[PDB]
Design a protein around this ligand. Structure first.
Ligand SMILES: CCCCCCCC/C=C\CCCCCCCC(=O)OC[C@H](COP(=O)(O)OCC[N+](C)(C)C)OC(=O)CCCCCCC/C=C/CCCCCCCC
Ligand SMILES: CCCCCCCC/C=C\CCCCCCCC(=O)O[C@H](COC(=O)CCCCCCC/C=C/CCCCCCCC)COP(=O)(O)OCC[N+](C)(C)C
Ligand SMILES: *[C@@H]1O[C@H](CO)[C@@H](O[C@@H]2O[C@H](CO)[C@@H](O[C@@H]3O[C@H](CO)[C@@H](O)[C@H](O)[C@@H]3O)[C@H](O)[C@H]2NC(C)=O)[C@H](O)[C@H]1NC(C)=O
Ligand SMILES: *[C@@H]1O[C@H](CO)[C@@H](O[C@@H]2O[C@H](CO)[C@@H](O)[C@H](O)[C@H]2NC(C)=O)[C@H](O)[C@H]1NC(C)=O
Ligand SMILES: *[C@@H]1O[C@H](CO)[C@@H](O[C@@H]2O[C@H](CO)[C@@H](O)[C@H](O)[C@H]2NC(C)=O)[C@H](O)[C@H]1NC(C)=O
Ligand SMILES: CC(C)CCC[C@@H](C)[C@H]1CC[C@H]2[C@@H]3CC=C4C[C@@H](O)CC[C@]4(C)[C@H]3CC[C@]12C
Ligand SMILES: CCCCCCCCCCCCCCCCCC(=O)O
Ligand SMILES: CCCCCCCCCCCCCCCCCC(=O)O
Ligand SMILES: CCCCCCCCCCCCCCCC(=O)O
Ligand SMILES: CCCCCCCCCCCCCCCC(=O)O
Ligand SMILES: CCCCCCCCCCCCCCCC(=O)O
Ligand SMILES: CCCCCCCCCCCCCCCC(=O)O
Ligand SMILES: *[C@@H]1O[C@H](CO)[C@@H](O)[C@H](O)[C@H]1NC(C)=O
Ligand SMILES: *[C@@H]1O[C@H](CO)[C@@H](O)[C@H](O)[C@H]1NC(C)=O
Lengths: 52, 438, 438
């Protein structure tokens, strides 16, 4: 099964196990303080449509 | 001292409220939400459970005749049948072949364990919020519980604290609520006295101690077969068991904002939505004088490493010069980053380390140590884990600094374009001036 | 049968709903309001009563010294007084001159009869209305009680009746309600934990079984006089007794719409405001066929005497021709008058009398007897009493008939003026036509 995890996060429970809460961090393949286009990629990997 | 602050409605997050008192040394306070509870008001409508069809032994009038008698019984049926010739094991029960009647009587009654096994239909309105807050400032460290409204004040170490009303009126419960044991369902239960057989609410009772019971189960009576005493009847199955094996998941599995629904009493706890206004009444005793507080000057901020992760991935090194050791209050005047510690040890070496959490690539938060001022600038990095099991400790600010590399390139391009545009404007202005000159 | 009607929310008003069923003889129904109850939901805030100042015997430390011991008591006060030289009847209590201390201790406790004598602060919201209705139609005459909302149905002689949602959300109670015995006051009681001495709420307790008690009575301790053991103290008097002898009148004396406020539980009864929608489900058995219903023709209405008083001061004489005796349903299709009775005896004389209540000088109401039709016209008179002890039985219609004497004179004047105006218009039109013709 595939579970989408966002900034607000999820909490998944399976069987009688106690619930497990997970949150998604601000990860991406872009470079933060490099060339301009790497910065484009950085701010596109997180918040795509807004930076487009 | 009169001071108001606004805190997020998030459990496990400590807000840092800073008091700049005039004649005293600044103080930074720990506002920690340990747990909330959104408590709706329930109006019981009726009680629904499995029914019990009571079929007494039929009276068989051997060579005779009786008439049906009306009874004040819920879902009562009474059918007389003529011409019956029943049989027993030893032989024929009655005497005449066709001159006989059998009295069939059946009715619906509250089951013996509606007192145990039942579901309650409620109406939820005017949810009342109550939250648990820890106050730890200066030398004290206390926890108290208060109703979240502008009409409750609780004493904390001589202080008058009032948490003003929940920013939003949002509730996870709908108008109609059905509760079974520890589960709560957002269900449109049928109105009282209008139940259908085979569905939830087929039989309804106002109270567990109710004497009046409404039953609509479409009970039917039919001729017995020849030579048999069995009181045939066909009736709709219980809607309670149908609901039990068609209920599905409760509100706990679909509540927004990560609400945890419990019963006894029905409540929604630790919902992460809205803000909690805070009004503070701090006496003089808590504060410290600047004559006994160290004087901090020459504060510069330089940053070694910073990562904008959920936790405090930013590391800040501060340099300053003090006269005496002691304890300063540290605060971030900008939401870009939040300093993990509120008071650090201030000594002679003049250098201190701080842990801060940010969410932007180039954060610009401002740090004040005692009464000193400085600007902290950093280049934070994209972190390592796609997923972490803890929530973000920052305010989720992703706008880079006005002086960040991206904003530096944008500003350079804008400056060049504006210089070209202003040069064109000046050239055209001079040309037009010369034209009107001639 | 599907039929909806709207009735006034007035106790003792003989509202009459008429069903024109297609294949059956018309039926007129008596909807009577016997009594209502507007039932608010109460959230208890705290319990206020007289306090009790407990002053134990003072410890007198003869030629010695003690220190005050802190105690977890509401409004606790402790003071050690030095240099005391008390006296008794036989002589001096302590041995030394000024080397002595007396321990003064006092506190506030819940009075022994807060369990008996107390006032409760409430919040009122979501008032639930329940009304008592009599249904008497055809041959049946029954009374039932139902909650006034579009979600309750009660069985009346095989009929499904639902009293629809009340037209107005008006309530006599405010947000904050204070109840003392059988009186209810619309009072802004102080928030919990913010009471002032000498006023209502000086001491507050969440529940009668509460262990925590909040007390703010400004208790003060002072030196004893020389040679006396009396534990002097000055304290603010109880705000509960002040409220008791400054409460004034309760909501019963100021409630609008003639509401009668009672307690156990808090409620407002027989408020005359709004309308009560009615949805009706009548089976076939109740109605009567036109083949067995008399055929009424040639119905004219003439009126002998009529007075537009509160009661049925109008007298109507109807003439008709029937074939067989029996019982017709009579109704007024106009709100100008209301016929007192709903079914009269129909016989061969073909001459019946009706009592009706009106409020206009020249009423024009229409009367249908079985399926017949006629128009009733009368000149009603100004009545004899300035004051009567009963409410009006009409709909309070004062617009005179289109054919009344006043409207007759108005219409005559308007007709004459319009004839003159149209004559002038025609003369000018002809003149203008001739001018463009030349
Ligand atoms: C010397 C000659 C004098 C002649 C004067 C005028 C005569 C002609 C009048 C009417 C002509 C008939 C056409 C209908 C239009 C007006 C209708 C009318 O009259 O009644 C309409 C309604 C029905 O009455 P109701 O009992 O259901 O409501 C009262 C509520 N209760 C009793 C419970 C308190 O009444 C209401 O609601 C009205 C509530 C209060 C209104 C105040 C404004 C005063 C104006 C009234 C209209 C008159 C027209 C004036 C000029 C006309 C030119 C000839
Ligand atoms: C020469 C280029 C000029 C063209 C610019 C055209 C603008 C684009 C128009 C529409 C875009 C739709 C997307 C919504 C905008 C979100 C912004 C926002 O919302 O900003 C927020 C607040 O900003 C402000 O307070 C105002 C400060 C900035 C405004 C003006 C700055 C001057 C120039 C702009 C630089 C950026 C554009 C140029 C870069 C491109 C060059 C290659 C950011 O703060 P936050 O983290 O709370 O936001 C995150 C949102 N959170 C946390 C709620 C999820
Ligand atoms: C029995 O009575 C005798 C009378 O002599 C008490 O002696 C008094 O005890 C008080 C105890 O507080 C003492 O006063 C002390 O005086 C010194 C010097 O001025 C000063 O440091 C304090 O005032 C200190 O408390 C002192 O022994 C004495 N005072 C006098 C002589 O009047 C004795 O305590 C009594 N014992 C009992 C248990 O009855
Ligand atoms: C003030 O006290 C609370 C309650 O004791 C502290 O919370 C504890 O933190 C420690 C770690 O130092 C945990 O191991 C305990 O489990 C916590 N106790 C709880 C949650 O009941 C809190 O850290 C203190 N805050 C200060 C010092 O400002
Ligand atoms: C239906 O029955 C009720 C209860 O008997 C009647 O109410 C009474 O009417 C008689 C006079 O005929 C008197 O005892 C009182 O006037 C009424 N007593 C009350 C108010 O309880 C009522 O009149 C009948 N309703 C109908 C047929 O309209
Ligand atoms: C080096 C230069 C040329 C790179 C270009 C910078 C541009 C593309 C970057 C810099 C700052 C960025 C914005 C920062 C904040 C936000 C708010 C967020 O909710 C959506 C994305 C959005 C709106 C980003 C869009 C892309 C953005 C405007
Ligand atoms: C920001 C720097 C300001 C200095 C502005 C310098 C002005 C540019 C120098 C030459 C301007 C001449 C352009 C006008 C065209 C001349 C021909 C004409 O007017 O017919
Ligand atoms: C309702 C009755 C309709 C009949 C209308 C009759 C018309 C009146 C008779 C005379 C009308 C003549 C008025 C026009 C003035 C004549 C002089 C002119 O046009 O220069
Ligand atoms: C942004 C770079 C510096 C700004 C100055 C740019 C100089 C542009 C050259 C000036 C335009 C040529 C002058 C004659 C123009 C004309 O009148 O036709
Ligand atoms: C933004 C476009 C122009 C609107 C603002 C007008 C204010 C400035 C005045 C215009 C220049 C007038 C001076 C005379 C020179 C000329 O005639 O060109
Ligand atoms: C309402 C009463 C009847 C209506 C007719 C009224 C007759 C009015 C007289 C007619 C006006 C005189 C004709 C000549 C007018 C003109 O053109 O100057
Ligand atoms: C209400 C005032 C007049 C407005 C309505 C106009 C419609 C009727 C047409 C006017 C009469 C036109 C016929 C020609 C005769 C003329 O010129 O007077
Ligand atoms: C959730 O709520 C309870 C009480 O409201 C609280 O004690 C508990 O710590 C909370 N759980 C979380 C998310 O920490
Ligand atoms: C007022 O209310 C009660 C019950 O609501 C009712 O029984 C009583 O008859 C009413 N009084 C009047 C005005 O008739």
């Amino acid at each position: 099964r595939t579970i989408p995890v966002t900034e607000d996060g999820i909490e998944y429970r399976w069987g009688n196990n106690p619930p497990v809460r997970l949150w998604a961090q601000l990860t991406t393949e872009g470079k933060p303080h490099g060339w301009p286009h790497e910065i484009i990629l950085y701010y596109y990997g997180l918040y795509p449509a807004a930076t487009i | 001292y009169e001071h108001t602050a606004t805190i997020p409605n998030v459990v496990g997050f400590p807000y840092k409220a800073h008091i700049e008192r005039n004649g005293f040394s600044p103080m930074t306070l720990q506002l920690e939400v340990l747990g909330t509870s959104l408590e709706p008001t329930l109006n019981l409508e009726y009680i629904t459970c499995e029914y019990k069809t009571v079929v007494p032994s039929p009276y068989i009038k051997c060579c005779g005749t009786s008439e049906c008698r009306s009874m004040e019984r819920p879902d009562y049926q009474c059918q007389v049948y003529t011409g019956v010739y029943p049989f027993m094991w030893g032989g024929a029960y009655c005497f005449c072949d066709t001159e006989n009647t059998q009295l069939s009587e059946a009715y619906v009654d509250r089951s013996d364990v509606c007192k145990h096994d039942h579901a309650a239909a409620y109406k939820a309105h005017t949810a009342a919020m109550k939250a648990t807050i820890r106050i730890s400032y200066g030398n004290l460290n206390q926890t108290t519980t208060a109703f979240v409204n502008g009409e409750h004040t609780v004493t904390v170490g001589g202080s008058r604290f009032t948490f003003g009303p929940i920013s939003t009126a949002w509730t996870p419960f709908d108008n109609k609520i059905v509760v079974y044991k520890n589960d709560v369902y957002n269900q449109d239960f049928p109105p009282y006295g209008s139940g259908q057989p085979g569905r939830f609410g087929d039989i309804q009772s106002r109270t567990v101690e109710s004497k009046d019971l409404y039953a609509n189960t479409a009970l039917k009576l039919s001729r017995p077969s020849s030579g048999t005493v069995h009181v045939p009847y066909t009736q709709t199955p219980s809607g309670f068991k149908y609901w039990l094996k068609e209920r599905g998941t409760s509100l706990n599995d679909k509540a927004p904002f990560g609400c945890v629904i419990k019963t006894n009493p029905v409540r929604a706890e630790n919902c992460a939505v809205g803000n909690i206004p805070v009004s503070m009444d701090i006496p003089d005793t808590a504060f410290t004088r600047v004559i006994d507080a160290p004087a901090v000057t020459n504060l510069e901020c330089q940053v070694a490493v910073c990562t904008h992760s959920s936790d405090f991935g930013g590391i800040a090194t501060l340099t300053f010069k003090t006269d005496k050791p002691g304890k300063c209050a540290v605060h971030s005047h900008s939401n870009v980053a939040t300093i993990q510690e509120a008071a650090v040890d201030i000594k002679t070496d003049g250098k201190i380390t701080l842990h801060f959490s940010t969410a932007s690539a180039s954060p610009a938060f401002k740090v004040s140590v005692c009464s000193a001022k400085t600007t902290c600038t950093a280049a934070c990095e994209p972190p390592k884990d796609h997923i972490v099991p803890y929530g973000a400790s920052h305010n989720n600010q992703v706008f880079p600094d006005m002086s960040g590399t991206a904003m530096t390139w944008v500003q350079r391009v804008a400056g060049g374009l504006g210089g070209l545009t202003l040069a064109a404007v000046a050239v055209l202005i001079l040309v037009t001036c010369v034209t009107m000159r001639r």
